[PDB]
C-alpha cells in the first residue's frame, strides 16, 4: 500500500508546512492591520490635539 504511505506523509507534510506558514504569514498581516488600528487611534488623537 504505497498509497497509505503517500497519504500518511502527504497529509502531514503538505498541510503542516502550508498551513503553519499561513498561520504565521497572516499573523504578520494581522499585526500590521492591528498597527493600522493603532495608527487610527493616533490619527484620532492628533486630530483632537490640533
Amino acid at each position: 500500500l504505497n498509497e497509505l504511505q503517500a497519504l500518511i506523509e502527504a497529509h502531514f507534510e503538505n498541510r503542516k508546512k502550508e498551513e503553519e506558514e499561513l498561520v504565521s504569514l497572516k499573523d504578520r498581516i494581522e499585526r500590521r492591520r492591528a498597527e493600522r488600528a493603532e495608527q487610527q487611534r493616533i490619527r484620532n488623537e492628533r486630530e483632537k490635539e490640533r
Binding site: 500500500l1 498509497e3 497509505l4 497519504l7
Partner: peptide, 29 residues
C-alpha cells in the same frame, strides 16, 4: 482516518487468512 480504514482492511485480510488457516488447521484433524 482512511489510512486505517485501509490498514484495517489489510490487517483484516492478514488475520482472516491466518484465521482461515487456524480454522482449516483444526478442521483438517
Amino acid at each position: 482516518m482512511d489510512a486505517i480504514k485501509k490498514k484495517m482492511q489489510m490487517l483484516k485480510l492478514d488475520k482472516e487468512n491466518a484465521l482461515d488457516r487456524a480454522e482449516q488447521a483444526e478442521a483438517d484433524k
